[PDB]
Amino acid sequence: SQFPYSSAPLRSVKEVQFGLLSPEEIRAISVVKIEYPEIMDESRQRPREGGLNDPKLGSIDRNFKCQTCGEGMAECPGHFGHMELAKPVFHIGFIPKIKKVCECICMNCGKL
Amino acid sequence: NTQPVVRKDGMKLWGTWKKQPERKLLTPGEILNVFKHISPEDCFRLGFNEDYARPEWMIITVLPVPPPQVRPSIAMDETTQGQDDLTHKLSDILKANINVQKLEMDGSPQHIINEVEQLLQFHVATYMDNDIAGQPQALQKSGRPVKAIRARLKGKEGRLR
Amino acid sequence: ELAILKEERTTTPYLTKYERARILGTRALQISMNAPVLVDIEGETDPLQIAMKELSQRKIPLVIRRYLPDGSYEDWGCDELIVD
Amino acid sequence: VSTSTVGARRRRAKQQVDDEENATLLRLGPEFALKQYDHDGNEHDLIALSLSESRLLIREALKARSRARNGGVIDDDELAKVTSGAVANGVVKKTLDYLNTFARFKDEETCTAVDQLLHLHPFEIAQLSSLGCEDVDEAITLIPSLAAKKEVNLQRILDELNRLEDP
Amino acid sequence: LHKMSMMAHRVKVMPYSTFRLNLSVTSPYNADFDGDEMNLHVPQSEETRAELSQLCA
Amino acid sequence: VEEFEKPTRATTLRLKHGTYEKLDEDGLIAPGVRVSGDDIIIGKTTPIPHTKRDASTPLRSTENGIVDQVLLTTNQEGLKFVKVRMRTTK
Amino acid sequence: ETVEILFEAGAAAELDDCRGVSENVMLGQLAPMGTGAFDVMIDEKLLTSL
Amino acid sequence: AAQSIGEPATQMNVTLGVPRLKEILNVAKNIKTPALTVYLDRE
Amino acid sequence: GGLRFGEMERDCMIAHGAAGFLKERLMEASDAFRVHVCGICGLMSVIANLKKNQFECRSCKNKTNIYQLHIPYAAKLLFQELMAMNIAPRLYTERSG
Amino acid sequence: QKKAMSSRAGVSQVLNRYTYSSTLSHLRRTNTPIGLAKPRQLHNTHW
Amino acid sequence: MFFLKDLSLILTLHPSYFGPQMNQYLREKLLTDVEGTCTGQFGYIVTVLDGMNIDVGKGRIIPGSGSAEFEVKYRAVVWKPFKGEVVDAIVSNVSPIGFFADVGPLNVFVSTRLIPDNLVYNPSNSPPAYMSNDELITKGSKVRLKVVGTRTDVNEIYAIGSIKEDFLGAI
RNA sequence: AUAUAUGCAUAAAGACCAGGCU
DNA sequence: ATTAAAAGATAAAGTAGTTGAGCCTGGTCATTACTAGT
DNA sequence: ACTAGTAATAACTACTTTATCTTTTAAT
Numbered sequence A: 001s002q003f004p005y006s007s008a009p010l011r012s013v014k015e016v017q018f019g020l021l022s023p024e025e026i027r028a029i030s031v032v033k034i035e036y037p038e039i040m041d042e043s044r045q046r047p048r049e050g051g052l053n054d055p056k057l058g059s060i061d062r063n064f065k066c067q068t069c070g071e072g073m074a075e076c077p078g079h080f081g082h083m084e085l086a087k088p089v090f091h092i093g094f095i096p097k098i099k100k101v102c103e104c105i106c107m108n109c110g111k112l
Numbered sequence B: 001n002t003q004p005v006v007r008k009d010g011m012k013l014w015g016t017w018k019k020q021p022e023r024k025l026l027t028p029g030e031i032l033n034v035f036k037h038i039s040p041e042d043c044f045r046l047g048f049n050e051d052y053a054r055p056e057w058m059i060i061t062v063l064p065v066p067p068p069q070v071r072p073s074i075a076m077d078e079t080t081q082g083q084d085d086l087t088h089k090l091s092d093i094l095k096a097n098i099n100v101q102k103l104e105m106d107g108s109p110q111h112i113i114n115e116v117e118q119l120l121q122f123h124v125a126t127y128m129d130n131d132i133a134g135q136p137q138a139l140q141k142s143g144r145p146v147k148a149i150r151a152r153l154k155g156k157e158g159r160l161r
Numbered sequence C: 001e002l003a004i005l006k007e008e009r010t011t012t013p014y015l016t017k018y019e020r021a022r023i024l025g026t027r028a029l030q031i032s033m034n035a036p037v038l039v040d041i042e043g044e045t046d047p048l049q050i051a052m053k054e055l056s057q058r059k060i061p062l063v064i065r066r067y068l069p070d071g072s073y074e075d076w077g078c079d080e081l082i083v084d
Numbered sequence D: 001v002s003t004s005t006v007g008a009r010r011r012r013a014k015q016q017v018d019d020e021e022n023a024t025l026l027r028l029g030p031e032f033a034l035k036q037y038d039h040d041g042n043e044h045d046l047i048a049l050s051l052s053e054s055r056l057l058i059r060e061a062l063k064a065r066s067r068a069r070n071g072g073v074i075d076d077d078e079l080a081k082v083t084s085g086a087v088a089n090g091v092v093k094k095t096l097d098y099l100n101t102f103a104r105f106k107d108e109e110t111c112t113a114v115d116q117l118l119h120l121h122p123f124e125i126a127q128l129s130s131l132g133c134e135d136v137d138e139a140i141t142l143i144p145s146l147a148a149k150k151e152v153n154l155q156r157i158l159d160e161l162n163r164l165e166d167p
Numbered sequence E: 001l002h003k004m005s006m007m008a009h010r011v012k013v014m015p016y017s018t019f020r021l022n023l024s025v026t027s028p029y030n031a032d033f034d035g036d037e038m039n040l041h042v043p044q045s046e047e048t049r050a051e052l053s054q055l056c057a
Numbered sequence F: 001v002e003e004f005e006k007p008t009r010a011t012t013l014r015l016k017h018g019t020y021e022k023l024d025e026d027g028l029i030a031p032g033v034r035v036s037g038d039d040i041i042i043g044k045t046t047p048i049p050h051t052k053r054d055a056s057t058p059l060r061s062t063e064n065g066i067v068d069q070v071l072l073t074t075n076q077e078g079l080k081f082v083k084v085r086m087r088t089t090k
Numbered sequence G: 001e002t003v004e005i006l007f008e009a010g011a012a013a014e015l016d017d018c019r020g021v022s023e024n025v026m027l028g029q030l031a032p033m034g035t036g037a038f039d040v041m042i043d044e045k046l047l048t049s050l
Numbered sequence H: 001a002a003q004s005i006g007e008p009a010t011q012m013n014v015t016l017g018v019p020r021l022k023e024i025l026n027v028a029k030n031i032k033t034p035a036l037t038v039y040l041d042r043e
Numbered sequence I: 001g002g003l004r005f006g007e008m009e010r011d012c013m014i015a016h017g018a019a020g021f022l023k024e025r026l027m028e029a030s031d032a033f034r035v036h037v038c039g040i041c042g043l044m045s046v047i048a049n050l051k052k053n054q055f056e057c058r059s060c061k062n063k064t065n066i067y068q069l070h071i072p073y074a075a076k077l078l079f080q081e082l083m084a085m086n087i088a089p090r091l092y093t094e095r096s097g
Numbered sequence J: 001q002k003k004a005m006s007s008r009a010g011v012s013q014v015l016n017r018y019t020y021s022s023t024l025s026h027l028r029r030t031n032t033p034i035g036l037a038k039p040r041q042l043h044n045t046h047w
Numbered sequence K: 001m002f003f004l005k006d007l008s009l010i011l012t013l014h015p016s017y018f019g020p021q022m023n024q025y026l027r028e029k030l031l032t033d034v035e036g037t038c039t040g041q042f043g044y045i046v047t048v049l050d051g052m053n054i055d056v057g058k059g060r061i062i063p064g065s066g067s068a069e070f071e072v073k074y075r076a077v078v079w080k081p082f083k084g085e086v087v088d089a090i091v092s093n094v095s096p097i098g099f100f101a102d103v104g105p106l107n108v109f110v111s112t113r114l115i116p117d118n119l120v121y122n123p124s125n126s127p128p129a130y131m132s133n134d135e136l137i138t139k140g141s142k143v144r145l146k147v148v149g150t151r152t153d154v155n156e157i158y159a160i161g162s163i164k165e166d167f168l169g170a171i
Numbered sequence L: 001a002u003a004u005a006u007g008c009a010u011a012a013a014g015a016c017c018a019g020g021c022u
Numbered sequence M: 001a002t003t004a005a006a007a008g009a010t011a012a013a014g015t016a017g018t019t020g021a022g023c024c025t026g027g028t029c030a031t032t033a034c035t036a037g038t
Numbered sequence N: 001a002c003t004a005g006t007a008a009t010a011a012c013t014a015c016t017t018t019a020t021c022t023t024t025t026a027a028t
C-alpha cells in the first residue's frame, strides 16, 4: 500500500500467454533506436543520445528522472529499445527446432 | 524439386543435395524467406500459432535492448563507473553490426563478409547462451566467462530458484 | 449458471480449519478497522478474541464460497456451518 | 472508470484499418455496434434515443429519483436540484437547458404518436426524430444516410413529419 | 524436512542473547544445544497472525 | 591522490553519519581511546575529477572496544599506510 | 531445465491457466491452497436482519 | 505425503536402503539384483 | 542483511496450508512492486505518468484498457529478460476460455 | 593469470594462527586433487 | 448524442460501513460516481435510470485489506459526439478567431476558416455578431453545425464544428 | 526591470575464489 | 517358376543433463607495446 | 627529442540419433 495512487484498476493475473516477439511488435514497443557504440560524449556526464544508456530507456538514479515515464527510479519499470541488424541471425535456443522445420516443409515452395 | 538433407554443425546448418551431391550453407536470410511463405493452414498444422508463434520469428532480425534496470550500472572504485557483462556484450554486438554495415557498403571480399557475419552470430549466441557445447565460450575482458541470461535464469542460485 | 442451489449443496456442513482460520483473520482485521460488533464486549480488547466470541455465537456476517473443481461454487453462510 | 459488456478484443497479428469513427460511412465503432449484449448476454439491437425520446426518459428518470428520495411529490431547476454534486448538478442543468429548448415533441401524446409513426439503422430514426427536416434535398444534404437506402420514399415520410408530427 | 520443523510459538521476552526452547520440542526440530542457530519470523498482519495461531501452533 | 586528514562538511562531501570528533588533525584516532560502533577511526578524503569527497573507513556496526595501537608507514608506491588495532574483552 | 522449457513454451505458444501453486507463488498472489482454496463473501441477509 | 516419505530416508541378499529407493523412484530398466518369487502348488 | 526463506520453507508453508502468510512473506516482506499492463497486448510496455494521470500503450494505441498489478520485482526482472530473449510472456487478467 | 581455469587451486593457503597446534597441523597438511568413496577410505598402507 | 448504454462499475466499501443500510450507501455511491462523468470509450454520461432498486450483487472481500468489492450492473443514458454528425446548438462567445457553441455539456468550437465568407464579424454591433445579407449570428442564437473532430482528455470531450456546407447556419 | 550564477547536508559496488560452521 | 530392388525394422553408437540445506570469515577485481604532448 | 595514456591480448543414467542390417516384397 506504499505505492503512489493510480487510477488504473487493480486485479490479479489469471492467464499467462507465451509466444515469440514479432519484429513489428519489437519495433512498436521500443522507444529509442540504439546505434552508437560509444557511451559517453566527451566524459562530462550527459550520456550519448541513442546509445546503450540513453535516458529514454529508464532512470536508475535520483539525480535525473526518466524522460519517458516521468517518475523516479522507485516507480519507473524501465523501457525497451530496438537495434536493427544488418543481416538475420539464428537464435541459439531455436537452432534444432528450425532444422526440424527444414525437414518438414519444402525449401522452394515452402510447402509440407 | 528434390529436398536437401540438413545437418547441424555448431551454429551452422549444412544442406546437402543428393543429385555427386552438393553441400552448401543455409544462410538465415534464405531460411527466413522460405519460412515467410508458409500458409496459415500449414503453420497451424505444424504446431505453430498464426497469431502468437510464427516460425519466421524464430530467426532474429531485430534485437530488443533491455532497460538499464536489467543491467544496473556498476562502480569498480568510487567515482569511476563500470559496466555489466550485458552492457559490454551489447556494445560488442552493436560494434559487430556496424562493422558488417560499414564493410557491406564498401567492397565485397566475400570471405571477409562470411567471417564477420559468423563473428556477429557467435556474439549474439553467446549473448543469449554462453554455455554452448562443442565450442569455446566467450570470455569477458578480465578473462572470466561472460555471464549470459541463460546462466542468470537456471541454476540453484539462478533467478527462478 | 455456475451457482449451486441451496437444496442441492453436497459439501460438508462443518467448518474446516482453513475456513475457520480465514474467517477469524478477516473478522479480526475488520474489527480492527472499526467495524460494527454483533456481540457484547465485556473485558476483551484483542480483535481476535472478539472474532472468536462472534464465531462461537455464530454471528459473523461472512459467506464462504466453496469452489468445485469444475468451476461451480456453493455459498454457505457462517451462521449455518457447524463449528466444533 | 466504468466498463461495459463489450470487451476482450486482444491484440492480433494483423491490424485493422477500419477503426476511426465516421457517421457518413455509418460506422459507430465497437462500443456502439449494431448488436449489444444485455445482463444475460443475449443479443439486442442498438438503442438510439431521439431528443423527444431523450426528454421523456430524462423526465421519467428524474421523477423516479424524486420518488425514491423525497417520496411522492415540474421545473428544470428543480430537477437539477434533485441530484447532488457540483459537477453532476452543472451537467444536468446544462443538458436540460439544451434539451428542453430543442425538443421537437414535448408532450406524451405526440411522443406516443411518433412511437407509432416510427414503427433500419437506429441512427436514422434518431436523426429523423431529432433535427428538423422540411425538404428531401436538405434531408439528404444534411446527412447522407437518407441519400442511399434503395427504399427511400422521403416524400411521404417527410410529409408525415411535417403534418402528422410537429411541423 | 517436514512441517514440524517450522512452528508457531508465543514470544516471551527474556534477557541474554539466546533463544529459549522447551526440551520437548527439540526432537521435532532435530536440534540440540551445542551451537545450533535457529530462525524466527514475525507476521505483520492480523490475518496471518490468526493463520499462525490457528494452523501452525 | 587521497589524503589522510579530518574531513569537514565545508570542504568534503559524502560524509558518513558516524562520529568524526574522535579523530586527530592527521585523520587518525589516538590509541587508548574508547570507541563504539559506527565511528570513524581512519579519515581519508579523495579529490573529484567541495573538491573532495569522504572515503573514511568506520568501525564495524556491531563491534565495540578500545583503540590499542596505531601504525603509520609507507607502501611500495610511496604513499601513506595505516593500520589501527583495537582490543576488546570477551 | 528452466530455459529449455521456457523456449519450448515460447515456440509452442502455450497458455498457462495459473491454477497451480508454483506460478501463483512466483507471481505473488494468494495460491488456491489451504486458506486460499475459497472466497469469502459478505452476508447481506444477516446484516439486514439486524 | 512427499515429506512423510522423504523423512525416514534421512534416518535410513537383495538391494535395500537408499540405493533401492532411488532405483524404484527412477524406474530403472536394469535391476541391480533381479529376482522372482515362485509359489508352487499345494501338493 | 535479511534471512532467506528457501524452497523448503515454502514447502512447509504449503503443507501447513497458510497461503496468506506465504503471500505476505514473499511479497510484503520482500521485493513487492507495482507494474502496468495493457488489456490488448498483455505486455508490460505501458507508459504511465501518475503525476498528470496519462496511461498509453504505443503498440496497441491504447489509453483506456490498462490495468495495474502487484508482483515481485524478481518476476518483473524475469519478464523483462524473457522479452530481451525474444520471448513474449503476456499477462492477462481475464480467462479467454 | 590468463589461464585462471584448468589449473590447481588451493595449493597456497593463509596460515592459521588460532593456536600453536592448529598452526602445526596446517603446516603438516596434504591434499589430493580429485575433488566415489574409494580414495576417501583409510587404507591399510596409511599405518 | 443521446444513447442508451449498459455499464458496470466496481465499488469499494470500507469495513466501517458494514451495516444494515449498506445497500442504500452503495446506491448513493453509484449515483454520485456515475452521473456527470465522462469516459473515452462511452462519452459523457447523462444519468442513470431505475437506480432506486438496482442490484448491487454480493461483495468481494479483498484478502489483506478487508474492504468489499461490488460489481454493480446498470442501465444508463449517455451522450457521445460523432464525427460528421450535424447538430443544432446555441452559441455562447463570438470572436474573430472563432466562436463557441453548446451541445449539452459539450462545447464545440468553430474556427474562422469554417464560416462562409458572406458572414463578417463586427465588433461595433451590440452584441458583437457575425452579420451578412439577411444573416445574423449574435450570442445565444440558434445555429446548425457539423462535427468535424473529437478529442478526449478522460475528464472532458472537445469538438470542432464547421458550417461550410449547404443547409447549415442560423435558424 | 532585475540583477548574475562565483553552493550544494548521505550515497548504497556487485560478481567470483578460498577456508570454515551444523 | 525364381531373385533384383528396396522400404523399412532395428541394432548399435553418439550425445547430454546434474548433482542436501543454510550461515560465517577473508581476498581479488589484468597487461604492455603503439603513438601523441612540449 | 622523451613520456604516459591506452587499448587489445564428472560418472551415472538417460535419451536421442545414426547407420546398419535384412528381411521383406515384388520382379528376373
Ligand SMILES: [Mg+2]
Pocket (backbone or CB within 6 Å): E031, E032, E033, E034, E035, E036, L022
Ligand atoms: Mg547440533
Ligand SMILES: [Zn+2]
Pocket (backbone or CB within 6 Å): A057, A058, A059, A066, A067, A068, A069, A070, A071, A076, A077, A078, A079
Ligand atoms: Zn520511466
Ligand SMILES: [Zn+2]
Pocket (backbone or CB within 6 Å): I038, I039, I040, I041, I042, I043, I057, I058, I059, I060, I061, I062
Ligand atoms: Zn498494448
